Amino acid sequence: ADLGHQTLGSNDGWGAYSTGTTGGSKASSSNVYTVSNRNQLVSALGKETNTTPKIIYIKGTIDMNVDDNLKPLGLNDYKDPEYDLDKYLKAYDPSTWGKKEPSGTQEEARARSQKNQKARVMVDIPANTTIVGSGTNAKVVGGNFQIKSDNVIIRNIEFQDAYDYFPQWDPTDGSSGNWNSQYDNITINGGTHIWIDHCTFNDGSRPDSTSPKYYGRKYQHHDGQTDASNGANYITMSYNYYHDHDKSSIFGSSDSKTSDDGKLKITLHHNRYKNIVQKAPRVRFGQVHVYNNYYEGSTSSSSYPFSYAWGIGKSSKIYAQNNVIDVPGLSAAKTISVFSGGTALYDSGTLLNGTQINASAANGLSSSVGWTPSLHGSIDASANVKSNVINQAGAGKLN
Numbered sequence: 001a002d003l004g005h006q007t008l009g010s011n012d013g014w015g016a017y018s019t020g021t022t023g024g025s026k027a028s029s030s031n032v033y034t035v036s037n038r039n040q041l042v043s044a045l046g047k048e049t050n051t052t053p054k055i056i057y058i059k060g061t062i063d064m065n066v067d068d069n070l071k072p073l074g075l076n077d078y079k080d081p082e083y084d085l086d087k088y089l090k091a092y093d094p095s096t097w098g099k100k101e102p103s104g105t106q107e108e109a110r111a112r113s114q115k116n117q118k119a120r121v122m123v124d125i126p127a128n129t130t131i132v133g134s135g136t137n138a139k140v141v142g143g144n145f146q147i148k149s150d151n152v153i154i155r156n157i158e159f160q161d162a163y164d165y166f167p168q169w170d171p172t173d174g175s176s177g178n179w180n181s182q183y184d185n186i187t188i189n190g191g192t193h194i195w196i197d198h199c200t201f202n203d204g205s206r207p208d209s210t211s212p213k214y215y216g217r218k219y220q221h222h223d224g225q226t227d228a229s230n231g232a233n234y235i236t237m238s239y240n241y242y243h244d245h246d247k248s249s250i251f252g253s254s255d256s257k258t259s260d261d262g263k264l265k266i267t268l269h270h271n272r273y274k275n276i277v278q279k280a281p282r283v284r285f286g287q288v289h290v291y292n293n294y295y296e297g298s299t300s301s302s303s304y305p306f307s308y309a310w311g312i313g314k315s316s317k318i319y320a321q322n323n324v325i326d327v328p329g330l331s332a333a334k335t336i337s338v339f340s341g342g343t344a345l346y347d348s349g350t351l352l353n354g355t356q357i358n359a360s361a362a363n364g365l366s367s368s369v370g371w372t373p374s375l376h377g378s379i380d381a382s383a384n385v386k387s388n389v390i391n392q393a394g395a396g397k398l399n
Protein backbone atom coordinates (compact mmCIF):
# COMPACT_ATOMS: atom_id res chain seq x y z
CA ALA A 1 0.00 0.00 0.00
CA ASP A 2 0.99 3.64 -0.50
CA LEU A 3 1.58 6.19 2.28
CA GLY A 4 -2.09 7.22 2.43
CA HIS A 5 -3.30 3.62 2.79
CA GLN A 6 -0.70 2.22 5.20
CA THR A 7 -1.84 1.27 8.71
CA LEU A 8 0.00 0.93 12.02
CA GLY A 9 1.74 -2.45 12.33
CA SER A 10 -0.12 -4.98 14.48
CA ASN A 11 2.60 -4.99 17.16
CA ASP A 12 3.85 -1.41 16.80
CA GLY A 13 3.31 0.11 20.24
CA TRP A 14 0.25 0.94 22.33
CA GLY A 15 -1.58 2.37 19.28
CA ALA A 16 -1.93 -1.24 18.02
CA TYR A 17 -4.06 -2.32 21.00
CA SER A 18 -7.60 -3.66 20.53
CA THR A 19 -8.97 -2.31 17.23
CA GLY A 20 -5.56 -0.89 16.26
CA THR A 21 -4.91 2.27 14.25
CA THR A 22 -6.02 2.12 10.63
CA GLY A 23 -6.91 5.79 10.16
CA GLY A 24 -8.69 6.43 6.85
CA SER A 25 -7.13 3.46 5.03
CA LYS A 26 -10.57 2.10 4.05
CA ALA A 27 -11.52 5.36 2.30
CA SER A 28 -13.24 5.28 -1.08
CA SER A 29 -11.70 7.38 -3.88
CA SER A 30 -14.22 10.20 -3.34
CA ASN A 31 -12.89 10.63 0.21
CA VAL A 32 -9.27 11.01 -0.92
CA TYR A 33 -8.34 14.71 -0.94
CA THR A 34 -5.29 16.77 -1.91
CA VAL A 35 -5.15 20.10 -0.04
CA SER A 36 -2.83 23.10 -0.38
CA ASN A 37 -4.31 25.84 1.81
CA ARG A 38 -6.38 26.36 4.97
CA ASN A 39 -9.73 26.50 3.13
CA GLN A 40 -9.20 23.15 1.40
CA LEU A 41 -7.95 21.55 4.62
CA VAL A 42 -10.91 22.65 6.76
CA SER A 43 -13.36 21.63 3.99
CA ALA A 44 -11.87 18.12 3.69
CA LEU A 45 -11.91 17.52 7.45
CA GLY A 46 -15.54 18.60 7.90
CA LYS A 47 -17.11 18.47 11.38
CA GLU A 48 -17.18 15.90 14.21
CA THR A 49 -19.92 13.96 12.38
CA ASN A 50 -17.60 13.26 9.41
CA THR A 51 -16.61 9.79 10.64
CA THR A 52 -16.38 8.26 7.15
CA PRO A 53 -12.87 6.94 6.44
CA LYS A 54 -10.93 9.71 4.67
CA ILE A 55 -7.38 10.30 3.38
CA ILE A 56 -5.95 13.83 3.20
CA TYR A 57 -2.72 14.67 1.40
CA ILE A 58 -1.02 17.94 2.33
CA LYS A 59 0.79 19.45 -0.66
CA GLY A 60 3.22 22.29 0.01
CA THR A 61 2.93 24.78 2.85
CA ILE A 62 -0.33 25.39 4.69
CA ASP A 63 -0.34 28.65 6.66
CA MET A 64 -3.13 28.63 9.26
CA ASN A 65 -2.95 32.35 10.08
CA VAL A 66 -4.98 33.40 7.02
CA ASP A 67 -8.53 34.69 6.52
CA ASP A 68 -11.21 33.16 4.26
CA ASN A 69 -9.64 34.81 1.19
CA LEU A 70 -6.22 33.37 2.10
CA LYS A 71 -4.82 36.73 3.22
CA PRO A 72 -2.17 36.53 5.94
CA LEU A 73 -3.33 37.64 9.39
CA GLY A 74 -0.99 39.20 11.96
CA LEU A 75 -1.03 40.83 15.41
CA ASN A 76 -3.05 43.85 14.27
CA ASP A 77 -5.73 41.73 12.55
CA TYR A 78 -6.44 39.65 15.68
CA LYS A 79 -6.07 42.34 18.34
CA ASP A 80 -9.17 43.46 20.25
CA PRO A 81 -9.69 47.24 19.98
CA GLU A 82 -8.95 47.83 23.69
CA TYR A 83 -5.83 45.64 23.89
CA ASP A 84 -2.46 47.37 24.03
CA LEU A 85 0.76 45.56 24.97
CA ASP A 86 2.30 48.69 26.53
CA LYS A 87 -0.80 49.15 28.71
CA TYR A 88 -0.85 45.41 29.53
CA LEU A 89 2.76 45.60 30.73
CA LYS A 90 2.10 48.69 32.86
CA ALA A 91 -1.02 47.21 34.46
CA TYR A 92 0.40 43.86 35.60
CA ASP A 93 3.98 44.85 36.47
CA PRO A 94 4.94 42.82 39.55
CA SER A 95 6.27 45.92 41.36
CA THR A 96 2.87 47.65 41.28
CA TRP A 97 0.41 44.78 40.70
CA GLY A 98 1.96 42.15 42.98
CA LYS A 99 1.71 38.37 42.64
CA LYS A 100 -2.03 38.12 41.91
CA GLU A 101 -3.61 36.88 38.68
CA PRO A 102 -4.14 39.63 36.11
CA SER A 103 -7.68 40.99 35.93
CA GLY A 104 -9.46 44.11 34.70
CA THR A 105 -9.49 45.84 31.32
CA GLN A 106 -6.20 44.77 29.72
CA GLU A 107 -6.47 41.07 30.66
CA GLU A 108 -10.06 40.91 29.36
CA ALA A 109 -8.95 42.54 26.09
CA ARG A 110 -6.02 40.12 25.78
CA ALA A 111 -8.33 37.14 26.34
CA ARG A 112 -10.70 38.35 23.60
CA SER A 113 -7.72 38.82 21.27
CA GLN A 114 -6.58 35.25 21.94
CA LYS A 115 -10.03 33.87 21.05
CA ASN A 116 -9.88 35.68 17.69
CA GLN A 117 -6.64 33.84 16.83
CA LYS A 118 -7.89 30.52 18.24
CA ALA A 119 -10.75 30.48 15.73
CA ARG A 120 -8.35 30.36 12.75
CA VAL A 121 -5.46 28.24 14.06
CA MET A 122 -7.10 25.39 15.98
CA VAL A 123 -8.72 22.63 13.92
CA ASP A 124 -10.30 19.39 15.15
CA ILE A 125 -9.57 16.07 13.40
CA PRO A 126 -12.55 13.72 13.06
CA ALA A 127 -12.45 9.96 13.56
CA ASN A 128 -11.08 7.56 10.94
CA THR A 129 -8.73 10.00 9.25
CA THR A 130 -5.26 9.72 7.72
CA ILE A 131 -3.37 12.98 7.11
CA VAL A 132 -0.09 12.51 5.23
CA GLY A 133 2.41 14.89 3.67
CA SER A 134 2.95 14.69 -0.09
CA GLY A 135 6.61 14.56 -1.14
CA THR A 136 9.41 15.97 1.00
CA ASN A 137 8.23 19.51 1.77
CA ALA A 138 4.71 19.24 3.20
CA LYS A 139 4.36 21.80 5.99
CA VAL A 140 1.77 23.11 8.44
CA VAL A 141 2.71 26.55 9.79
CA GLY A 142 0.99 28.15 12.78
CA GLY A 143 -1.74 25.53 13.22
CA ASN A 144 -2.75 23.48 16.25
CA PHE A 145 -4.32 20.13 15.32
CA GLN A 146 -6.58 18.82 18.10
CA ILE A 147 -7.51 15.15 18.30
CA LYS A 148 -10.45 14.22 20.53
CA SER A 149 -11.55 11.30 18.36
CA ASP A 150 -10.54 7.70 17.69
CA ASN A 151 -8.43 6.20 14.89
CA VAL A 152 -6.17 8.87 13.39
CA ILE A 153 -2.85 8.69 11.51
CA ILE A 154 -0.62 11.76 10.91
CA ARG A 155 2.61 11.25 8.94
CA ASN A 156 5.35 12.97 6.91
CA ILE A 157 4.51 16.58 7.75
CA GLU A 158 6.76 19.32 9.16
CA PHE A 159 4.79 21.23 11.82
CA GLN A 160 6.20 24.69 12.47
CA ASP A 161 5.73 27.52 14.93
CA ALA A 162 2.34 27.18 16.61
CA TYR A 163 2.60 30.81 17.68
CA ASP A 164 0.38 32.73 20.09
CA TYR A 165 0.30 36.49 19.49
CA PHE A 166 -1.06 37.20 23.01
CA PRO A 167 0.80 35.31 25.77
CA GLN A 168 -0.74 35.61 29.24
CA TRP A 169 1.28 36.75 32.27
CA ASP A 170 1.06 34.41 35.27
CA PRO A 171 2.95 35.71 38.30
CA THR A 172 2.18 32.58 40.35
CA ASP A 173 3.66 30.15 37.79
CA GLY A 174 6.96 28.99 39.30
CA SER A 175 9.21 31.16 41.45
CA SER A 176 9.37 34.37 39.40
CA GLY A 177 6.24 34.02 37.26
CA ASN A 178 6.13 33.05 33.57
CA TRP A 179 4.44 34.00 30.30
CA ASN A 180 2.10 31.28 29.00
CA SER A 181 0.71 30.63 25.51
CA GLN A 182 -2.05 28.34 24.26
CA TYR A 183 -1.08 26.46 21.10
CA ASP A 184 0.71 23.20 20.45
CA ASN A 185 1.48 21.63 17.10
CA ILE A 186 -0.70 18.66 18.08
CA THR A 187 -2.96 18.40 21.14
CA ILE A 188 -4.39 14.95 21.96
CA ASN A 189 -7.42 15.67 24.16
CA GLY A 190 -9.11 12.37 24.98
CA GLY A 191 -8.14 10.91 21.58
CA THR A 192 -7.52 7.17 21.21
CA HIS A 193 -5.78 4.91 18.65
CA ILE A 194 -3.42 7.50 17.16
CA TRP A 195 -0.19 7.12 15.20
CA ILE A 196 2.12 10.13 14.73
CA ASP A 197 5.03 9.06 12.52
CA HIS A 198 7.84 10.62 10.50
CA CYS A 199 6.83 14.18 11.38
CA THR A 200 9.09 17.12 12.23
CA PHE A 201 8.28 19.63 14.98
CA ASN A 202 10.05 22.98 15.42
CA ASP A 203 9.59 26.70 16.08
CA GLY A 204 10.09 27.61 12.43
CA SER A 205 11.27 31.13 11.69
CA ARG A 206 10.33 32.48 15.15
CA PRO A 207 12.53 30.69 17.71
CA ASP A 208 12.41 31.78 21.35
CA SER A 209 15.57 33.95 21.30
CA THR A 210 13.77 36.27 18.84
CA SER A 211 11.41 37.12 21.74
CA PRO A 212 12.29 39.88 24.21
CA LYS A 213 12.06 39.46 27.99
CA TYR A 214 9.34 41.25 29.96
CA TYR A 215 9.52 41.32 33.77
CA GLY A 216 12.78 39.32 33.52
CA ARG A 217 11.01 36.37 31.86
CA LYS A 218 11.03 35.38 28.19
CA TYR A 219 7.91 36.51 26.32
CA GLN A 220 6.90 32.98 25.33
CA HIS A 221 4.71 32.59 22.24
CA HIS A 222 4.85 28.78 22.16
CA ASP A 223 3.53 25.90 24.22
CA GLY A 224 3.87 22.18 23.49
CA GLN A 225 4.73 20.07 20.48
CA THR A 226 2.78 16.85 21.03
CA ASP A 227 0.77 16.93 24.27
CA ALA A 228 -1.78 14.39 25.51
CA SER A 229 -4.44 14.90 28.18
CA ASN A 230 -7.84 13.93 29.55
CA GLY A 231 -7.77 10.15 29.17
CA ALA A 232 -5.90 10.02 25.85
CA ASN A 233 -4.96 6.37 25.27
CA TYR A 234 -3.39 3.85 22.89
CA ILE A 235 -0.96 6.06 20.96
CA THR A 236 2.30 5.36 19.10
CA MET A 237 4.69 8.21 18.24
CA SER A 238 7.59 6.98 16.10
CA TYR A 239 10.42 8.35 13.95
CA ASN A 240 9.64 11.99 14.69
CA TYR A 241 12.18 14.80 14.78
CA TYR A 242 11.63 17.36 17.54
CA HIS A 243 14.01 20.32 17.54
CA ASP A 244 14.59 23.91 18.60
CA HIS A 245 11.77 24.18 21.12
CA ASP A 246 11.31 24.58 24.88
CA LYS A 247 8.51 22.38 26.29
CA SER A 248 8.09 19.29 24.10
CA SER A 249 5.58 16.71 25.33
CA ILE A 250 3.33 16.68 28.41
CA PHE A 251 1.38 13.45 28.98
CA GLY A 252 -1.23 13.97 31.70
CA SER A 253 -2.08 17.60 32.47
CA SER A 254 -2.79 17.56 36.23
CA ASP A 255 -2.02 15.76 39.48
CA SER A 256 -5.70 15.89 40.50
CA LYS A 257 -6.94 14.17 37.32
CA THR A 258 -7.01 10.70 38.89
CA SER A 259 -9.17 9.39 36.01
CA ASP A 260 -5.98 9.42 33.89
CA ASP A 261 -4.74 6.47 35.99
CA GLY A 262 -4.89 3.38 33.77
CA LYS A 263 -4.82 5.55 30.63
CA LEU A 264 -2.09 7.51 28.81
CA LYS A 265 -0.73 4.28 27.32
CA ILE A 266 1.80 5.71 24.88
CA THR A 267 4.79 4.30 23.03
CA LEU A 268 7.61 6.62 21.95
CA HIS A 269 10.30 5.08 19.74
CA HIS A 270 12.99 6.15 17.30
CA ASN A 271 12.35 9.86 17.88
CA ARG A 272 15.08 12.49 17.69
CA TYR A 273 15.17 15.38 20.16
CA LYS A 274 17.70 18.12 19.33
CA ASN A 275 17.94 21.43 21.23
CA ILE A 276 14.84 20.62 23.28
CA VAL A 277 14.82 22.22 26.76
CA GLN A 278 12.49 20.05 28.82
CA LYS A 279 9.53 17.72 29.13
CA ALA A 280 10.47 15.01 26.67
CA PRO A 281 8.29 13.65 27.91
CA ARG A 282 6.93 14.83 31.27
CA VAL A 283 4.56 12.09 32.48
CA ARG A 284 1.78 11.77 35.04
CA PHE A 285 -0.01 8.42 35.61
CA GLY A 286 0.64 6.69 32.26
CA GLN A 287 2.31 3.45 31.24
CA VAL A 288 4.71 4.97 28.70
CA HIS A 289 7.19 2.84 26.77
CA VAL A 290 10.20 4.95 25.74
CA TYR A 291 12.74 3.12 23.56
CA ASN A 292 15.46 3.76 20.98
CA ASN A 293 15.19 7.57 21.13
CA TYR A 294 18.12 9.95 20.71
CA TYR A 295 18.51 13.16 22.69
CA GLU A 296 21.20 15.74 21.89
CA GLY A 297 21.77 19.22 23.29
CA SER A 298 23.93 21.53 25.37
CA THR A 299 23.43 23.04 28.82
CA SER A 300 25.19 26.25 27.71
CA SER A 301 23.20 26.86 24.52
CA SER A 302 22.12 30.47 23.93
CA SER A 303 18.74 29.55 22.42
CA TYR A 304 17.44 26.25 23.84
CA PRO A 305 19.65 24.97 26.69
CA PHE A 306 19.07 21.40 27.87
CA SER A 307 17.39 21.08 31.27
CA TYR A 308 16.22 17.46 31.45
CA ALA A 309 14.75 14.72 29.25
CA TRP A 310 12.25 12.61 31.20
CA GLY A 311 9.89 14.16 33.73
CA ILE A 312 8.91 11.62 36.40
CA GLY A 313 5.54 12.95 37.55
CA LYS A 314 2.80 11.74 39.86
CA SER A 315 2.25 8.00 39.57
CA SER A 316 4.07 7.80 36.22
CA LYS A 317 5.14 4.34 35.05
CA ILE A 318 7.80 4.98 32.40
CA TYR A 319 9.49 1.85 31.01
CA ALA A 320 12.63 2.96 29.14
CA GLN A 321 14.96 0.85 27.03
CA ASN A 322 18.11 1.57 25.03
CA ASN A 323 17.90 5.35 24.79
CA VAL A 324 20.97 7.48 24.00
CA ILE A 325 21.66 10.94 25.46
CA ASP A 326 24.49 13.17 24.23
CA VAL A 327 24.73 16.30 26.43
CA PRO A 328 28.28 17.32 27.36
CA GLY A 329 28.97 17.50 31.09
CA LEU A 330 25.58 16.20 32.28
CA SER A 331 25.54 13.88 35.30
CA ALA A 332 23.54 10.64 35.33
CA ALA A 333 21.01 11.88 37.90
CA LYS A 334 20.26 15.09 35.96
CA THR A 335 19.03 13.31 32.80
CA ILE A 336 15.59 13.24 34.45
CA SER A 337 13.61 15.48 36.81
CA VAL A 338 11.48 13.95 39.60
CA PHE A 339 8.24 15.60 40.76
CA SER A 340 6.13 15.02 43.88
CA GLY A 341 4.32 11.69 43.56
CA GLY A 342 6.93 10.21 41.18
CA THR A 343 8.60 7.22 42.84
CA ALA A 344 9.31 4.68 40.10
CA LEU A 345 11.13 4.42 36.77
CA TYR A 346 12.47 1.42 34.86
CA ASP A 347 15.44 2.19 32.60
CA SER A 348 17.80 -0.24 30.90
CA GLY A 349 20.55 0.38 28.34
CA THR A 350 20.65 4.15 28.88
CA LEU A 351 23.79 5.63 27.32
CA LEU A 352 24.92 9.06 28.55
CA ASN A 353 27.80 10.54 26.56
CA GLY A 354 29.03 7.07 25.56
CA THR A 355 28.71 5.46 29.02
CA GLN A 356 26.02 3.14 30.38
CA ILE A 357 24.10 4.70 33.28
CA ASN A 358 21.08 3.90 35.46
CA ALA A 359 18.91 7.02 35.76
CA SER A 360 16.39 5.39 38.12
CA ALA A 361 19.01 4.20 40.62
CA ALA A 362 20.86 7.53 40.56
CA ASN A 363 17.66 9.26 41.72
CA GLY A 364 16.70 6.64 44.35
CA LEU A 365 13.58 5.53 42.51
CA SER A 366 12.04 2.08 42.49
CA SER A 367 12.49 0.04 39.30
CA SER A 368 9.14 -1.70 39.80
CA VAL A 369 6.59 0.00 37.53
CA GLY A 370 4.15 -2.92 37.58
CA TRP A 371 4.08 -3.61 33.84
CA THR A 372 6.22 -4.75 30.90
CA PRO A 373 5.46 -3.65 27.32
CA SER A 374 3.76 -6.37 25.26
CA LEU A 375 3.34 -4.44 22.01
CA HIS A 376 6.62 -3.47 20.34
CA GLY A 377 8.66 -4.03 17.18
CA SER A 378 12.34 -5.03 17.26
CA ILE A 379 14.57 -3.24 19.75
CA ASP A 380 17.84 -1.80 18.48
CA ALA A 381 21.02 -2.10 20.54
CA SER A 382 21.94 1.22 22.19
CA ALA A 383 25.14 1.29 20.08
CA ASN A 384 23.14 1.73 16.83
CA VAL A 385 20.45 4.16 18.01
CA LYS A 386 22.23 7.41 17.10
CA SER A 387 22.84 6.34 13.48
CA ASN A 388 19.40 4.80 13.01
CA VAL A 389 17.55 7.81 14.42
CA ILE A 390 19.60 10.56 12.72
CA ASN A 391 19.22 8.80 9.34
CA GLN A 392 15.53 7.87 9.59
CA ALA A 393 13.63 10.27 11.86
CA GLY A 394 11.62 13.25 10.64
CA ALA A 395 9.44 14.44 7.79
CA GLY A 396 10.68 14.08 4.21
CA LYS A 397 12.32 10.66 4.67
CA LEU A 398 9.31 8.98 3.05
CA ASN A 399 6.86 10.24 0.41
Ligand SMILES: [Ca+2]
Binds near residue numbers: 183
Ligand atom coordinates in the same frame (compact mmCIF):
# COMPACT_ATOMS: atom_id res chain seq x y z
CA1 LIG B 1 -0.43 22.20 25.64
